[PDB]
Design a protein around this motif. Structure first.
Motif, PDB file in Angstrom:
ATOM      1  N   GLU A  52       0.817  -1.285   0.064  1.00  0.00           N
ATOM      2  CA  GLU A  52      -0.045   0.098  -0.220  1.00  0.00           C
ATOM      3  C   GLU A  52       0.883   1.474  -0.060  1.00  0.00           C
ATOM      4  O   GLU A  52       0.639   1.921  -1.008  1.00  0.00           O
ATOM      5  CB  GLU A  52      -1.019   0.124   1.207  1.00  0.00           C
ATOM      6  CG  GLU A  52      -2.229  -1.017   1.088  1.00  0.00           C
ATOM      7  CD  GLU A  52      -1.678  -2.374   1.125  1.00  0.00           C
ATOM      8  OE1 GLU A  52      -1.318  -2.918  -0.044  1.00  0.00           O
ATOM      9  OE2 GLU A  52      -1.590  -3.058   2.028  1.00  0.00           O
TER      10      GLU A  52
ATOM     11  N   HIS B 215       5.554   6.040 -10.180  1.00  0.00           N
ATOM     12  CA  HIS B 215       4.441   5.695 -10.939  1.00  0.00           C
ATOM     13  C   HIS B 215       4.734   3.845 -11.033  1.00  0.00           C
ATOM     14  O   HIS B 215       5.847   3.448 -11.005  1.00  0.00           O
ATOM     15  CB  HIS B 215       3.789   6.339 -11.921  1.00  0.00           C
ATOM     16  CG  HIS B 215       4.940   6.399 -13.087  1.00  0.00           C
ATOM     17  ND1 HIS B 215       5.096   5.463 -14.035  1.00  0.00           N
ATOM     18  CD2 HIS B 215       5.745   7.729 -13.343  1.00  0.00           C
ATOM     19  CE1 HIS B 215       6.011   5.833 -14.783  1.00  0.00           C
ATOM     20  NE2 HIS B 215       6.371   7.123 -14.425  1.00  0.00           N
TER      21      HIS B 215
ATOM     22  N   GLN C 274       2.484   2.396  -7.129  1.00  0.00           N
ATOM     23  CA  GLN C 274       1.229   2.863  -6.521  1.00  0.00           C
ATOM     24  C   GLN C 274      -0.124   2.294  -7.156  1.00  0.00           C
ATOM     25  O   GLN C 274      -0.188   1.575  -8.223  1.00  0.00           O
ATOM     26  CB  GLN C 274       0.798   4.291  -6.980  1.00  0.00           C
ATOM     27  CG  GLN C 274       1.265   5.137  -5.663  1.00  0.00           C
ATOM     28  CD  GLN C 274       1.312   6.737  -6.057  1.00  0.00           C
ATOM     29  OE1 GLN C 274       0.236   7.545  -5.889  1.00  0.00           O
ATOM     30  NE2 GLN C 274       2.302   7.144  -6.435  1.00  0.00           N
ATOM     31  N   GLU C 275      -1.336   2.175  -6.290  1.00  0.00           N
ATOM     32  CA  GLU C 275      -2.341   1.469  -6.442  1.00  0.00           C
ATOM     33  C   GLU C 275      -3.524   2.386  -6.487  1.00  0.00           C
ATOM     34  O   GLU C 275      -3.566   3.368  -5.556  1.00  0.00           O
ATOM     35  CB  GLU C 275      -2.793   0.283  -5.559  1.00  0.00           C
ATOM     36  CG  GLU C 275      -3.319  -0.819  -6.420  1.00  0.00           C
ATOM     37  CD  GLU C 275      -3.436  -2.248  -5.663  1.00  0.00           C
ATOM     38  OE1 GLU C 275      -2.392  -2.264  -4.636  1.00  0.00           O
ATOM     39  OE2 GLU C 275      -4.211  -2.914  -5.643  1.00  0.00           O
ATOM     40  N   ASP C 276      -4.714   1.875  -6.817  1.00  0.00           N
ATOM     41  CA  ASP C 276      -5.896   2.821  -6.633  1.00  0.00           C
ATOM     42  C   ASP C 276      -5.611   4.162  -7.036  1.00  0.00           C
ATOM     43  O   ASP C 276      -4.682   4.572  -7.226  1.00  0.00           O
ATOM     44  CB  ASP C 276      -6.368   2.552  -5.136  1.00  0.00           C
ATOM     45  CG  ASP C 276      -7.297   1.575  -4.842  1.00  0.00           C
ATOM     46  OD1 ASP C 276      -6.497   0.376  -4.627  1.00  0.00           O
ATOM     47  OD2 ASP C 276      -8.309   1.371  -5.111  1.00  0.00           O
ATOM     48  N   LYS C 277      -6.934   4.902  -7.196  1.00  0.00           N
ATOM     49  CA  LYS C 277      -6.872   6.385  -7.421  1.00  0.00           C
ATOM     50  C   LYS C 277      -7.194   7.317  -6.190  1.00  0.00           C
ATOM     51  O   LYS C 277      -8.283   7.661  -5.884  1.00  0.00           O
ATOM     52  CB  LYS C 277      -7.685   6.744  -8.438  1.00  0.00           C
ATOM     53  CG  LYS C 277      -7.392   7.106  -9.722  1.00  0.00           C
ATOM     54  CD  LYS C 277      -7.040   6.064 -10.603  1.00  0.00           C
ATOM     55  CE  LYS C 277      -5.827   6.123 -11.594  1.00  0.00           C
ATOM     56  NZ  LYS C 277      -4.763   4.969 -11.334  1.00  0.00           N
ATOM     57  N   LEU C 278      -6.044   7.689  -5.557  1.00  0.00           N
ATOM     58  CA  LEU C 278      -6.227   8.435  -4.440  1.00  0.00           C
ATOM     59  C   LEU C 278      -5.341   9.845  -4.391  1.00  0.00           C
ATOM     60  O   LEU C 278      -4.319   9.923  -4.939  1.00  0.00           O
ATOM     61  CB  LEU C 278      -5.329   7.879  -3.322  1.00  0.00           C
ATOM     62  CG  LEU C 278      -6.143   6.616  -2.508  1.00  0.00           C
ATOM     63  CD1 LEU C 278      -5.189   5.484  -1.723  1.00  0.00           C
ATOM     64  CD2 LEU C 278      -7.325   6.958  -1.738  1.00  0.00           C
ATOM     65  N   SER C 279      -6.256  10.987  -4.640  1.00  0.00           N
ATOM     66  CA  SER C 279      -5.678  12.322  -4.792  1.00  0.00           C
ATOM     67  C   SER C 279      -6.064  13.024  -3.461  1.00  0.00           C
ATOM     68  O   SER C 279      -4.819  13.614  -3.012  1.00  0.00           O
ATOM     69  CB  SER C 279      -6.230  13.120  -5.922  1.00  0.00           C
ATOM     70  OG  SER C 279      -5.654  13.702  -6.886  1.00  0.00           O
TER      71      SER C 279
END
Length: 107
Positions: A35, A94, A97-102
């Motif tokens: 994570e 890049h 990383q995983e998922d879209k977290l902004s």
């Protein structure tokens, strides 16, 4: 057309690819946190040895490789850790990383 040509090589990418490529990496690194993206360098010797081959630097060694590991902290590519032989990819990097977290903030 598609092949897979970047043009500009990068250590952070090589060391990272090894984590996602268990077929090429032979117990050289370890996934401390998927994570967060934290990884350990089980084999600091094999890590560099392999790296050099990519840059054709027969005189490649951890001592040297690190030079880029500590220089990445300036750009963010890497994240400084208070552990031994333990690094972590920052936000600049890049692929790992995983998922879209902004976040709640944006420009």
């Amino acid at each position: 057309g598609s092949s897979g040509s970047s043009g500009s090589s990068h250590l952070w990418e090589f060391v990272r690819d090894l984590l996602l490529s268990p077929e090429e990496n032979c117990g050289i690194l370890e996934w401390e946190d998927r994570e967060q993206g934290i990884f350990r360098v089980v084999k600091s010797e094999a890590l560099a040895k392999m790296w050099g081959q990519r840059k054709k630097n027969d005189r490649m060694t951890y001592e040297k490789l690190s030079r880029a590991l500590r220089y990445y902290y300036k750009t963010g590519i890497l994240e400084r850790v208070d552990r031994r032989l333990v690094y972590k990819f920052g936000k600049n990097a890049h692929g790992w990383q995983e998922d879209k977290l902004s976040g709640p903030s944006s420009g």
